[PDB]
């Protein structure tokens, strides 16, 4: 394959999601949906009476469902959250202002999302493709928590006053907004709950938001394939525009990212409605893009495989990353995987390489790494692989307490 | 040791919890606390201003924290849940009436509990002894979800009209109340989220909960130790009184329960206050009990070790259970454990034996087992060990879809 494309649809489930999923199915591809369950409650200010139907269709069709928070952080765009808040925020256009405030309350929005999903569809955990408690993406934010060494934030994603185009707008990645700093803490809280978060390389979006039918201007299939060709192995998250979409410290050339392009788009760009004629114009664009991308040598995959699943029989090189049972591991030695030698908290063949900060078992810690343990923070003083006996509060030689 | 005692304290964290924890600490034992976080919000109708202090002390002292639901099901005891609901339910005393109603919303109370704990103590996940998302117990209910074969319900735990100690009360386990049936569905939902749930063998409590001044009728230490002696290997959950505390179909003689006694009591019984002089009378009893139990040969442990952790170097017999990374496994053949060969979804030496009903990999399914998969229910028509390509929707010889 020329590469692997990961289609990711955000902000569903809404009525428009149904035909999107039908087009993916017709095209013989699987995609990943980052959902906001407030649409199931009928308060997300979209056409959403079929939100549940869409959720079931996504899951029955085998697409991956990931977590984008209950309300897309709209509780931080209004004085008091209620049924009108989604519309109130769309009126003021303040989505990107003070988007993140109390990072603990904002991380809790991702759990509330699951409660709601599991309320409207009580059988949802019977679907293996339900990844709501494993994969997430932060609203507005091209931020990543993939492995211990593959992490980076969207340092100008959200603002404390001005929107990115308005005059007087500045962004300093070195000294980011309070909203950004809070979103960074959200990433960390989710990573310690076991989440991976992923941003994107290319945003399939209206090329003109300044007209009354912006959905119509969604990039056509042929040019969009050129954008994808250009993004392949070119570290797109750093060069992407606009500025609030950048991941400034993205680890360019990082092995996990080689020959991959993550596409971001939105279900709501594919309806005939307030943004224009998205269903009539853009459904054919999606069908065509899939057709031509395959013809050009690409394959399509889902974000549960972005970090490849450990596979019996596969040969791994030292330092390669896999996902096993939702946990990221890194190979200690080159070897060939077999049935009884799976990665784990006690394997000598692998170390845990989750993007978490809490002290964790079987992690290769380096001098200078900071870990949390029983409410305190510690520096690692001597490089070592952690084990159950070697807790930071009982190993004052391995760890230096801060703070 | 003569046997292992698991001290378990329910309905905290409250002011009374602090001195309980200090007695445990002075006595040199650890215990397991099944907490209701509504006390942290100040709406639980107990003396509870030191709730967060108690939580922190429990965790800093090495005690295990388990999940007892956010509000002890008080939402099902009132018309509309709010800040006064705890006092309203204490007025009617109707706690054990209609205790469980909508299983989905009742199970969601366990998740809300964790959101609240993780709000008041944002560092809580950095404590290994925080088991809030692994270990639970259902309010009012001596119910068990331990392994695939070790499960049983409290079939008279709660009722649809009369309290168990009122004249005219009847329970038929063969035809359980609606409340009990709903509570069974809550056990099943928690089990599918990866929880184990445990009941108890002996309760340090008044005769029944209808008894006036409950804290003033706890048994003395010496007789209580005698009750623990009698509970050892005697299937107490079947013989225990009163009737609402019984686990009727408890698997007498099940290996995991051998030589163990789980004690239940409540932190609020150790307070000088409305229920009696519980601090003055019962703190000394607890202290004395701990001393004489050790002197008699018992040891004390915590519920995170109730199922024993998998241990490298240990020789296992076919059929033996271990806990590994939060999951229960059962040995396939007698063998000696090696570092790189741990239980997992692909191990040949172990099968997954979580007490869950959703179809799961590497599980030894037996005829008559019913699994959930992608929203549908299937009967296991032929015994086998599940694996990735043997999903119910594609194996109509192994599985039989239900109407
Ligand atoms: C393990 C279990 O669920 N035990 C039950 C007790 O919690 C329960 O007592 C009542 O608990 C409520 C929640 O903490 C209190 O608000 C209430 O005041 C308390 N009642 C009394 C008289 O103290 C009892 C009573 O129904 O039943 C046990 O099964
Ligand atoms: Ca969880
Ligand atoms: Ca994970
Ligand atoms: Ca578990
Ligand atoms: Cl066993
Ligand atoms: Zn979004
Ligand atoms: Zn209780």
CATH number at residue B292: 3.20.20.370
Q: Which of B45, B43, B104, B98 is nearest to B76 (CA)?
A: B98
- Give exposure, B275-313, as e/b (b: 16+ Cβ within 10 Å): bbebbebbbebbbbbbeebbeeebebbbbbebbeebeee
Token pair of B355 as six digits: 């007490």
Where is the domain boundary, B307, B328, B343? Answer: B307
Q: How far apart are CA A371 and CA A386, in angstroms?
A: 11
**β-bridge partners, B303:** none
Burial of B362 (0-12, 13-18, 19+ CB in 10 A): buried
Q: How far apart are CA B127 and CA A17, in angstroms?
A: 41
Among candidates B108, B122, B312 on the partner chain, residue whose Cβ is nearest the Cβ of A115: B108
**β-bridge partners, B377:** B372
Q: Which residue of A has its CA nearest to B185?
A: A122
From the CB of B11, is ligand 1 less than 6 Å away?
A: yes
- Continuous segment of H or E residues that includes residue B364: strand B364-365
Q: How far apart are CA B320 and CA B233, in angstroms?
A: 18
Quickly list H helices, A147-243: 178-192, 221-231, 236-239
Q: How far apart are CA A65 and CA A85, in angstroms?
A: 25
Q: How far apart are CA B284 and CA A166, in angstroms?
A: 70
Chain CA centroid to CA A218, Å: 22
Q: How far apart are CA A30 and CA A290, in angstroms?
A: 11
Q: Which of B97, B194, B178 is nearest to B140 (CA)?
A: B97
Quickly list H helices, A93-146: 103-120
Domain of residue A372, CATH code: 2.10.10.90
Distances (CA, A) of A141 to A72, A228, B285: 11, 20, 57
Cα angle value A45/A50/A56 (rounded, 5°) = 125
Ligand 1 atom nearest to B209, measured from its CA: 25
Same domain, yes or no: A224 and A143: yes
CA of A121 to the centre of ligand 5 (A): 36
Q: Which of B175, B197, B176 is nearest to B187 (CA)?
A: B197
Name the residue with the closest Cα to ligand 1, atom 26.
B95
Q: Using the beta-carbon criterion (under 8 Å), do B346 and A111 form an inter-chain contact?
A: no
Q: How far apart are CA A216 and CA A218, in angstroms?
A: 6
Quickly list H helices, B195-271: 221-231, 236-239
Chain CA centroid to CA B381, Å: 32
Which residues of A250-302 form beta strands (DSSP E)? 260-266, 272-273, 276-277, 298-300
Cα angle value A138/A142/A147 (rounded, 5°) = 85
Chain CA centroid to CA A128, Å: 18
Among candidates B119, B125, B342 on the partner chain, residue whose Cβ is nearest the Cβ of A192: B125
Interface of B with A (CB under 8 A): 56, 59-60, 104-105, 108, 111-112, 114-115, 118-119, 121-123, 125-128, 189, 192-193, 312, 325, 339-342, 344-349, 358-359, 372-376
Q: Using the beta-carbon criterion (under 8 Å), do A345 and B359 form an inter-chain contact?
A: no
Same domain, yes or no: A264 and A327: no
- φ/ψ (deg, to 5) at A13: -85, 135
A51 touches A13 (CB < 8 A) = yes
Name the residue with the closest Cα to ligand 1, atom 10.
B95
Q: Which of A115, A327, A246, A220 is nearest to B324 (CA)?
A: A327
- Continuous segment of H or E residues that includes residue B260: strand B260-266
Token pair of B167 as six digits: 């004249």
Burial of B52 (0-12, 13-18, 19+ CB in 10 A): middle
CA of A335 to the centre of ligand 2 (A): 33
Same domain, yes or no: A162 and A255: yes
* Ligand nearest, relative to CA of residue A328: 3
Q: Which of B319, B321, B311, B363 is nearest to B342 (CA)?
A: B311
Same domain, yes or no: A151 and A220: yes
Number of H helices, E strands in chain B: 9, 22
Strand-strand pairing, A3-10 and A32-35: parallel
Q: How far apart are CA A73 and CA A85, in angstroms?
A: 11
Same domain, yes or no: B285 and B344: no
Q: Which residue of B has its CA nearest to A109?
A: B115
Q: How far apart are CA A377 and CA A393, in angstroms?
A: 10
Contacts of A312 in chain B (CB under 8 A): 346
Same domain, yes or no: A245 and A380: no
Burial of A229 (0-12, 13-18, 19+ CB in 10 A): middle
Cα angle value A347/A349/B360 (rounded, 5°) = 55
Contacts of B128 in chain A (CB under 8 A): 374, 391
Residue whose pair of structure tokens reads 């309350």 in the numeric block: A105
Q: How far apart are CA A140 and CA A107, in angstroms?
A: 14
Same domain, yes or no: B169 and B41: yes
Domain encompassing residue A340 = 308-403
Collect all residues with Cβ–Cβ distance below 8 Å to B164 and sequence separation of at least 6: B96, B156, B171, B208, B242, B243, B244
Token pair of B220 as six digits: 């003395």
Same domain, yes or no: B212 and B254: yes
Distances (CA, A) of B324 to B145, B309, B334, B365: 16, 6, 18, 20
CA of B305 to the centre of ligand 5 (A): 13
CA of A55 to the centre of ligand 2 (A): 20
Q: Using the beta-carbon criterion (under 8 Å), do B59 and A189 form an inter-chain contact?
A: no
Token pair of B394 as six digits: 């594609």
Same domain, yes or no: A293 and A319: no
Question: How many angstroms separate the CA of residue B120 from the nearest CA in chain A?
Answer: 9
DSSP state of B42: T
From which experimental method does this structure derive? X-ray
Ligand 1 atom nearest to B72, measured from its CA: 13
Contacts of B63 in chain A (CB under 8 A): none
Same domain, yes or no: B254 and B318: no
Q: How far apart are CA A99 and CA A75, in angstroms?
A: 9
- Give the count of domains, chain B: 2
Q: Which of A234, A216, A201 is nearest to A284 (CA)?
A: A216
Q: Using the beta-carbon criterion (under 8 Å), do A111 and B108 form an inter-chain contact?
A: no
**Residue B197 three-state SS:** strand
CA of B171 to the centre of ligand 7 (A): 21
Q: How far apart are CA B257 and CA B335, in angstroms?
A: 23
Same domain, yes or no: A235 and A318: no
How many inter-chain contacts (A to B, CB under 8 Å) are there?
A: 105
* Ligand nearest, relative to CA of residue B195: 4
Ligand 7 ion: residues within 5 Å (CB)? B 10-11, 139
- φ/ψ (deg, to 5) at B147: -140, 175
Contacts of B105 in chain A (CB under 8 A): 119
Chain CA centroid to CA A122, Å: 24
Ligand 1 atom nearest to B139, measured from its CA: 3
CA of B328 to the centre of ligand 4 (A): 7
Same domain, yes or no: B50 and B179: yes
Cα angle value A355/A12/A89 (rounded, 5°) = 95
Contacts of A114 in chain B (CB under 8 A): 111
Where is the domain boundary, A286, A307, A328? Answer: A307
Which residues of A254-383 form beta strands (DSSP E)? 260-266, 272-273, 276-277, 298-300, 315-316, 321-324, 327-331, 335-336, 350-352, 364-365, 370-373, 376-380
**Residue B20 three-state SS:** helix
Q: Which residue of B has its CA nearest to A108?
A: B115
Q: Which of B361, B364, B355 is nearest to B149 (CA)?
A: B355
Residue whose pair of structure tokens reads 């009617």 in the numeric block: B92
Pocket test for ligand 1, best of B72, B87, B201 (most atoms within 8 A of CB): B72
Strand-strand pairing, B196-197 and B135-136: parallel
A282 touches A269 (CB < 8 A) = yes
Q: What share of chain A is helix, strand, coil (3-state, %, to 5)?
A: 30, 20, 50
Q: Using the beta-carbon criterion (under 8 Å), do A126 and B192 form an inter-chain contact?
A: yes
Q: Using the beta-carbon criterion (under 8 Å), do B125 and A358 form an inter-chain contact?
A: yes
A363 touches A386 (CB < 8 A) = yes
From the CB of B100, is ligand 1 less than 6 Å away?
A: no
Where is the domain boundary, A307, A337, A358? Answer: A307
DSSP state of B268: G
Task: Compute how many other C-beta atoms are within 10 angstroms of the C-beta atom of residue A393.
Answer: 13
Question: How many angstroms separate the CA of residue A385 from the nearest CA in chain B?
Answer: 14
Q: Which residue of A has its CA nearest to B58?
A: A374
A310 touches A50 (CB < 8 A) = no
Q: Is the peptide bond before A242 cis (omega within 30 degrees of 0)?
A: yes
Number of H helices, E strands in chain A: 8, 22
Strand-strand pairing, A335-336 and A315-316: antiparallel
DSSP string covering A22-53, please? Answer: HHHHHTT---EEEE-GGGTTT-SSS--TTHHH
Ligand 1 atom nearest to B244, measured from its CA: 29
Quickly list H helices, B49-199: 51-60, 85-92, 103-120, 178-192
Distances (CA, A) of B28 to A97, B13, B240: 53, 20, 29
Q: Using the beta-carbon criterion (under 8 Å), do B375 and A347 form an inter-chain contact?
A: no
Task: Compute how many other C-beta atoms are within 10 angstroms of the C-beta atom of residue A2.
Answer: 13
DSSP state of A67: E
């Amino acid at each position: 394959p020329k590469g692997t494309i990961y289609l990711t649809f955000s902000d569903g489930p809404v009525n428009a999601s149904v035909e999107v999923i039908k087009v993916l199915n017709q095209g013989g591809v699987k995609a990943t949906f980052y959902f906001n369950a407030w649409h199931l409650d009928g308060i997300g200010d979209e056409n959403e009476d079929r939100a549940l139907e869409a959720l079931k269709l996504a899951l029955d069709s085998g697409h991956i469902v990931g977590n984008h928070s209950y309300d897309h952080m709209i509780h931080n765009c209004v004085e008091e959250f209620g049924p009108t808040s989604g519309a109130d925020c769309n009126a003021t256009g303040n989505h990107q202002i003070h988007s993140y405030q109390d990072p603990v309350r904002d991380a809790a929005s991702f759990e509330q999302n699951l409660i709601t999903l599991e309320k409207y569809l009580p059988t949802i955990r019977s679907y293996p493709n339900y990844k709501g408690y494993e994969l997430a993406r932060l609203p507005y934010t091209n931020g990543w928590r993939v492995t211990k060494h593959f992490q980076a934030d969207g340092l100008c994603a959200t603002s404390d006053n001005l929107k990115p185009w308005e005059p007087g707008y500045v962004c300093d990645p070195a000294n980011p907004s309070n909203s950004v700093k809070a979103s960074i803490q959200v990433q960390n809280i989710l990573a310690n709950q076991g989440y991976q978060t992923h941003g994107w390389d290319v945003d399939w979006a209206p090329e003109n938001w300044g007209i009354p039918m912006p959905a119509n201007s969604l990039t056509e299939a042929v040019p969009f394939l050129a954008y994808v060709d250009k993004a392949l192995n070119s570290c797109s998250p750093t060069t992407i525009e606009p500025i609030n979409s950048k991941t400034q410290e993205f680890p360019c050339g990082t092995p996990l990212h080689a020959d991959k392009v993550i596409v971001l788009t939105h279900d709501f760009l594919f309806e005939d409605g307030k943004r224009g004629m998205g269903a009539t114009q853009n459904l054919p664009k999606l069908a065509e893009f899939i057709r031509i991308a395959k013809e050009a040598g690409y394959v399509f995959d889902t974000m549960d495989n972005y970090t490849p699943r450990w596979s019996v029989g596969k040969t791994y090189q030292a330092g390669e990353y896999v996902l096993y049972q939702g946990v990221v591991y890194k190979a200690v030695i080159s070897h060939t995987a077999q049935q009884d030698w799976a990665p784990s908290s006690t394997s000598s063949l692998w170390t845990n390489a989750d993007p978490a900060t809490n002290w964790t078992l079987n992690v290769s810690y380096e001098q200078g790494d900071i870990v949390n343990y029983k409410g305190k923070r510690y520096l690692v003083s001597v490089p070592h692989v952690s084990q159950q006996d070697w807790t930071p509060d009982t190993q004052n030689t391995l760890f230096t307490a801060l703070e």
